[PDB]
Symmetry: C2
Subunit: 540 residues, 2 copies
Amino acid sequence: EDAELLVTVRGGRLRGIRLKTPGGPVSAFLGIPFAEPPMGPRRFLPPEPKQPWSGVVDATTFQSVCYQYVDTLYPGFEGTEMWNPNRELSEDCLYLNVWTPYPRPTSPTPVLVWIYGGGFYSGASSLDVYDGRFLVQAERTVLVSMNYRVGAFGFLALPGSREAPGNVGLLDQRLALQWVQENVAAFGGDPTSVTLFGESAGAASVGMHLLSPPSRGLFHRAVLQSGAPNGPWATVGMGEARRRATQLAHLVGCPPGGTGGNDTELVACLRTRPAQVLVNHEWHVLPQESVFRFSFVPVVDGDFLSDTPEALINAGDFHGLQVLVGVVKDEGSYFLVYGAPGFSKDNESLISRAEFLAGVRVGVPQVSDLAAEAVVLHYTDWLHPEDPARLREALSDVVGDHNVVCPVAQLAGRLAAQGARVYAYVFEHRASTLSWPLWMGVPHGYEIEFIFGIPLDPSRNYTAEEKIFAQRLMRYWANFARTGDPNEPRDPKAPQWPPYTAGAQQYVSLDLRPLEVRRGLRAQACAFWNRFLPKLLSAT
Amino acid sequence: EDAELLVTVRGGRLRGIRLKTPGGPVSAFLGIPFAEPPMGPRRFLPPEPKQPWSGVVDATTFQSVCYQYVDTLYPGFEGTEMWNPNRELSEDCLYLNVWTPYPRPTSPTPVLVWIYGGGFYSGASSLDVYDGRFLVQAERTVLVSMNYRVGAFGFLALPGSREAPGNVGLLDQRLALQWVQENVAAFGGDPTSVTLFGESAGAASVGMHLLSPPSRGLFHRAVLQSGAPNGPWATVGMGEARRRATQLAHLVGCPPGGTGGNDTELVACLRTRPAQVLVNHEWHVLPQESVFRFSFVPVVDGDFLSDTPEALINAGDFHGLQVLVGVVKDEGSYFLVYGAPGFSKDNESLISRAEFLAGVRVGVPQVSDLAAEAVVLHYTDWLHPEDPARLREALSDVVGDHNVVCPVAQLAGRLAAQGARVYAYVFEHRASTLSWPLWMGVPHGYEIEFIFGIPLDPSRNYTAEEKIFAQRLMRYWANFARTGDPNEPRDPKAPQWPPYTAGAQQYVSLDLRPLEVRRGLRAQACAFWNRFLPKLLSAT
């Protein structure tokens, strides 16, 4: 009972809180510090482990959200504000959360570790859609989720220097993984059965941990939902990361007018600026340059990532690894309202031929004019080259394929053909409570609410079929966490989920209907991006 | 005592509140309804007078702010969030506020009526900087301020139609003036000594009431601070107002796909949309245009304004009218951070030669390429054509002169030369508590806190010199409200404020020093805008 809400870890004692679900209680420990607050001189530096504390740290509520830009595209809209910070902003944000079933597991139980997304510039583990009380109750697994520094505070990089080495937001996640190895046993979790699962930039983070040797030894399985480290938005070069960091310093008045600016004086000037000042000038470091162009992302410096994610994926052995990858049916429609001309969530977004030609330049940035043409000519239905509805879905595919679906399919094929066991899915169910317009279909990020069993919340107006569908998805994710195989270990009644291989390229469709096997994660489209486009950009 | 907080008006009974000032108490009646809520079918329609109510309406706190865009340029910044709504948003917002001294004046007292600014798209009478408890206590005058519908709700116009006639936000102000005529006597105010004073779009509104016959009979004096009706941003043509209104309907999905769109079906579709939806698509009715191009402003339709404000000013008799006009020393610096390249409040904004050439295109929109050079060549110091600091102040002057200073000087000259007695000022004091950068000097809108005696608030950190300076400014404004002359009626010790004439063009400087008379409201610069530029734009 109340005795199970008291747990001692290597740093001290914690008091948790009991959460209610329609099927039983759950023990939650929200707000566990895993690192010293990275404030003052510790800004832009790798995280230091949290030193032990005296007394009982309160762990009954979520801690602060790391400083980040707040989306203001559609004020008062549920579809956008559900991803905005729901706690106060602070640099003191390195805290994690642990859910565990009641009664506490007596046997070592597999552990799921969630890494939120948000383009490496936003996100928090405290969002209502990441609530782990339903997944833990229904599947008796241990769920962990951490906060990591986003934006400039987590990924501003002056490569080579020691004051701003970059990738410190990735090190925050790694330190939280080392914390799980040393302390998850106190909650009834098996530190030898850890399964990372993330989404969007979280999925890219999960992939970058697979390609980093020090992080590979901290988990055993991986799940990448609608994201991958080899995406065109997920990394940046050393020279470009230096230009963006220097530009931000200029925007906030660094260095002072009559002064030199080596890497030491520049970061010293940045550390004196308030956090909100750095955030207010993040987006027009790249002006403008908003859609799929984030200013501060993981840098390829040679430390955390010894080479580019594409090179490490190709020249990598993945034997003894189980991966679960997947995307949603309409990956790009959510991002079109962020800068594509003629698009608006409040009308039908029936774009013209000229607006489609311009939209490709925003969804596929930094491409030659010849390469942009080849994209238009590949995605045009030449029997209906002027139909606005078809042009709308075409640009949605252009943006979804270039940024999400094809980097994932490229990764899933190389893993399965180099030792890894890979399962693939495509989420094709649109929630009955979805606030986005109908023409967006199944937007990016709207499978998370079903993985976490949010439809089981009695205060929400989901259908009965969606509740059963959410329970079936949670069993898929839990089975993969336990046995490395999403199929039920003994049930032959339900249709089977065949592994994804580089040849058959099999995946399943996740919706209210039973499982259906299909072949090809946009095989024809992704051949244009993964095979032809690097060839057209080679000979400029 | 508490008996003076009870007042009966022609509509019913009201209970006010006693406000504290360091020099004595003041009676305030905040939240008096002067019109029926313009919701449902009454959206976009002229206001109907508030029907009488039973009981005692509570008038102890400010009512709701009209639906409006919220500034998000610098989140958490005092300089911008002091103009954001400080109450909840609602279409039920047609309320006014009355301050009156304690004890209530027994004799008829002159009345000051405040009209807030905000580019006709924002603003509220509830902002802390518009608090009238200090002006009323120190000068024993009656202060009134109303809310009027801004944005599309106050100025969406389908000219000719009866469902969206336009200028209804100006009619809200007029109805509040009719209310003052019928009810200000109940508060101790003289309905025959009413002085309108506004700022920015408020000053433009005050000027448009001078040029509208039905509104001219509701006040006797006028004060225009940093704004004028003849400004390039303050009005719009009938055809352009129809294009902007139709574009907004398209952005919110009006009319539905298979449907025609005459002026009746279009506005009916608009009235079914939530208020926040119309606000979320207000700014990109004009795509990629923000600085001094507001989507919904007063329309020149022939009703409220029988002709353009420029035509009405030239062919108008102003005998028996006293006007007080003025600007701040740096009118344009505030607007540069809103879109001019190279500008940022957090650095020195030392722009290059190319950025100055591009900034003129944003500060002076919709002008020929030949006209843009004449602006550059007139504002370039050809001994230092590359000095960033001089180019910064140059673009600040370009924007300040074109939009504020010269439309005001054009108006002040025509008024003084056609019967009106005009006094002019230039506010040249930068507040010691100003949060904007130093290079902005005295930005637009930062004389309001001294007119309203805000430095007298003991919870604020103004200097002793600024407190005496605020009391001197309040006497200037109060004397003009009483006698139509800012000078003290019997004190010869302080320097005199000579009237502004079309020939001598005399004005005074308002700062910590005593009054100093000067000549010319940017006489050389405003000759370029008011005399030469129309000559270059005629012959394309």
